[PDB]
Design an enzyme around this catalytic site. Structure first.
Site: not given
Ligand code: NAP
Ligand code: NAP
Lengths: 495, 498
Positions: A272, A294, A320, A380, A400-401, A403, A441, A443
């Site tokens: 990645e 992805w 990105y 993100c 920002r977010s 997982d 966060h 899940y």
């Protein structure tokens, strides 16, 4: 064994439990471990020392271990040296006893001392553990197997790890120090709030009290979000527990922060990152590497759902890679030639670092506000900044977010590799990766998985070795990015 | 007073030292103060509770404090209640003695108990302090004056503050708790580094051991950079000590984080923020209001040396105001009308919050990479993000370059105001401001000033009250943004570098 309890072991142990090979240390010398042992076995509690500054600790060996230490400075400085054997007579300036049972009683009734330490021989370790004479083990953990013929016995299920140092490394091994052990109100009142706060429902590795392994930063955040996160539903999709605002940091000169409480997919991380570096927005490039992280975001169904009905499958838009290499260029499709278009933030930052490392503008920003509506997912890891001091490169990234289950372990390792690559190409040493989490966060369908994970004791982090002949960031391939001595708990599936 | 020492006081005190008015508490009920007193005076250490499960503390009151208490509320539950009086002889469920010294001696001889606390009033507080009988004061500090006829004595200079809570607030006062006090090897070994390390050269408020006032976050960063920062050249020509990577956070529901260890220029903070919000890049706007924080960055010499020879003085280029309201528009000069040009990030984020508090785009970005060549100085507070949970708004900001002495106190206050404004216009309560510092530095000519600063004991933070009638962020004026109960140490001159 009356009166022979409370013996303290010091030992260094390879991954396959080997401690010795042909009466010698199986691995090259780790000076840090020599100093650690010296410090651990020479300490006298101040109030004991203050009433008799003469008082010394006892250090006990089996016969073969004594003969293994260089015949030069055998009497270990500032300690009472004691050796055990049913054959050897007497040793130059050292107390000699027939067996251990008798050795301990003779020292404790006759010889003024502070504490007794058990320093080696599998034979001597064996007796001590088999009978229950040890309350504490200081163990140096080495993340590599070595050839040997002498082993540390299994540690009884009666012990637990209560302390883990940070991870360290030499050129040949990564390692850390652990402690195994058997088994003020104003601070509460001055929060100004509830003195009887319920215990958090979740605590990572609750037995470990001295928590210096960098992995505890991530495990504590997992436990914090489960304990205190707010449930954020989403219609059409999996709900998550969420909490805001964290910062983790990783010393990249010491080790490589690839999480050990589950087997993390390093190959996917590297591929990645190389894909970001090349500026690609074509999800097929990852699929050709059987990297599928992805894939769902590039599918016909998902794209149509988001309005990109005219966009080819796995054309991810100006994400990105495009922002890193072509910020401000007009995005067409994943096939277009963007050579000389937009701002190559990655090239410019590397050049800037080389030219003026004190620049306060060493930033790559993937948050291209004008381009958001052309991505199906906003970036993100959307902003990072480099910093140089004492010829060492650090990096701070804004996520920002986050997982926490699946994404964050990738981000930690990804930005750590990137920082090491940039440091190498600019002739710099390594500082820290500093990771800011905004919306962190978990899940709901990962809850059980992370509950399992936070109970697992971290292994020492591995270490990163880049191919030193690589001069340009675009030249790194997967074979040039090698993580050594990765020891992990098993993989934990997460959807 | 033989055997009468080590008596612990709890008291709540106004800024003018008032504790009573017409034999009542001069202020209405303070939620955390009530719990603090109750919790503080009932606690028994678990080990002490092991050797005597029925053991209790003693609380002592003078006669007028006793009469202020509803007879039905006595005795205070879970504690031995002692009244000192010559005129009252019997109080159901309580012990009564003629004076303090008789009480303490009889208690310590004949009435098994854990600790003795002194709960007022002024006469008893004065007897205790005048005779050296107190070793610890738990004091609730109220940040405003109250009318009253009854006072807490001056605290002898034999005491120092050793603990400070976070700041709390009601609708009528901000307050905190302090403690005044009269005056393991494995943890070292398991760092894996040197077992004996020299103390950092700089430590903020070294007498304060429990450091829960949010201001300590900032003071500790100043002390850390002074202790360990690297001397680093920069664009200004004034060198600074620099260290990388910090995070502070401030609970905006509890207090407003205007620093108390110097008098901070709040008016300048507010005017700067209103200027950002209106989208202005004209530095004359601020100068006309006698706010000079941007002056040096707009001067001829500065503009010329950054190559902006065609730029009018105090034309600050496409900085915060422009990016917040007009991201992606073509910057011309500070005089152009940019109405309906570029992306209005501020308006859109507010709309997004109202429409969907869980939106994935709750960012305002001032780092416009395409605009860097048009700026003499690029944005320092360059990226921020809003977040909602439990109908409370939080904000996280990335500051690339942090002038710790002069700039950071402004940033803390500025974003806290902005978050309160956005929360108000979206009908939300307040969460936290989380401030991320990248290159954090102290200019060499601020070193002495910040050394002075970190030795000062913080006062409770003030509180922020916005005009509740304001429904649109563009409608806030300086008169709508009010800070109440600000108590600070004196201002500390710090020169600006550019
Ligand atoms: N990595 C590490 O932390 C570490 C630490 C220490 C040692 N080592 C390694 O371990 C190896 C040596 O250990 P080893 O297990 O072979 O030998 P050892 O335990 O050092 O010594 C064996 C000899 O000592 C005597 N002895 C030992 N334990 C005894 C007991 N409990 N009661 C009575 N007598 C006892 C016996 O005496 P006699 O035969 O004389 O009658 C025995 O033959 C070396 O390779 C050394 O480098 C590694
Ligand atoms: N803000 C706070 O935390 C706080 C705390 C406590 C009180 N207060 C306020 O302060 C006011 C009460 O304080 P105050 O100074 O007016 O009165 P106080 O000290 O509560 O009571 C005065 C009375 O107590 C008796 N007394 C005290 N010490 C004595 C001793 N050593 N020997 C004999 N008698 C003794 C005297 O009894 P006789 O005349 O009956 O013999 C005297 O008249 C009230 O308004 C109350 O609300 C506030």
């Amino acid at each position: 064994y009356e009166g022979c309890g409370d013996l303290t072991i010091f030992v260094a142990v390879a991954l396959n439990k080997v401690i010795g090979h042909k009466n010698q240390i199986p691995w090259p010398h780790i000076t840090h471990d020599f100093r650690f042992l010296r410090n651990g076995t020479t300490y006298i509690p101040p109030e004991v020392l203050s009433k008799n500054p003469d008082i010394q600790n006892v250090v006990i060996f089996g016969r073969k271990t004594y003969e293994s230490i260089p015949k030069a400075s055998l009497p270990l400085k500032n300690r009472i040296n004691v050796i055990l054997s049913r054959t050897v007579k007497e040793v130059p300036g050292c107390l000699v006893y027939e067996d251990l049972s008798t050795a301990i009683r003779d020292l404790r009734a006759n010889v003024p001392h502070n504490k007794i330490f058990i320093l080696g021989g599998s034979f001597l370790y064996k007796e001590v553990l088999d009978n229950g004479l040890c309350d504490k083990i200081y163990l140096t953990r080495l993340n590599k197997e070595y050839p040997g013929d002498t082993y540390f016995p299994d540690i009884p299920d009666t012990f637990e790890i209560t302390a883990i140092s940070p991870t360290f490394s030499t050129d040949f091994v990564s390692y850390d120090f652990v402690i195994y052990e058997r088994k003020p109100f104003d601070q509460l009142l001055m929060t100004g709030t509830d003195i009887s706060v319920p215990k958090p429902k979740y605590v990572a590795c609750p037995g470990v009290r001295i928590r210096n392994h960098e992995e505890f930063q991530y495990l504590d955040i997992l436990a914090d979000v489960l304990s205190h996160g707010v449930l954020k539903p989403n219609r059409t999709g999996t709900d998550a527990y969420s909490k805001f605002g964290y910062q983790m940091r990783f010393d990249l000169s010491r080790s490589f922060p690839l999480l050990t409480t589950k087997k993390v997919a390093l190959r996917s991380i590297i591929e990645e990152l190389l894909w970001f570096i090349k500026g690609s927005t074509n999800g097929n490039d990852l699929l050709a590497k059987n990297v599928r992280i992805w894939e769902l975001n590039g599918r016909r169904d998902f794209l149509d759902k988001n309005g990109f009905t005219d966009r080819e499958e796995h054309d991810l838009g100006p994400i990105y890679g495009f922002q890193w290499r072509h910020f401000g260029a007009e995005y067409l499709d994943m096939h277009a030639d963007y050579t000389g278009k937009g701002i190559d933030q990655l090239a410019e930052i590397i050049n800037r670092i080389k030219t003026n490392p004190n620049d306060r503008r060493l930033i790559v920003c993937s948050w291209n506000v004008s381009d958001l509506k052309k991505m199906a997912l906003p970036p993100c890891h959307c902003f990072f900044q480099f910093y140089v001091s004492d010829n060492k490169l650090s990096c701070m990234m804004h996520q920002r977010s986050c997982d926490l289950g699946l994404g964050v372990p990738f981000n930690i390792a990804s930005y750590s590799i990137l920082t090491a690559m940039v440091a190498q190409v600019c002739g710099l040493g390594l500082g820290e990766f500093v990771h800011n989490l905004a919306d962190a966060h978990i899940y709901v369908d990962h809850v059980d998985a992370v509950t399992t994970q936070i109970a697992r004791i971290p292994h020492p982090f591995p270490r990163l070795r880049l191919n030193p002949d690589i001069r340009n960031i675009e030249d790194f391939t997967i074979d040039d990015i090698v993580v050594e001595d990765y020891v992990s708990h098993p993989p934990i599936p997460m959807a």
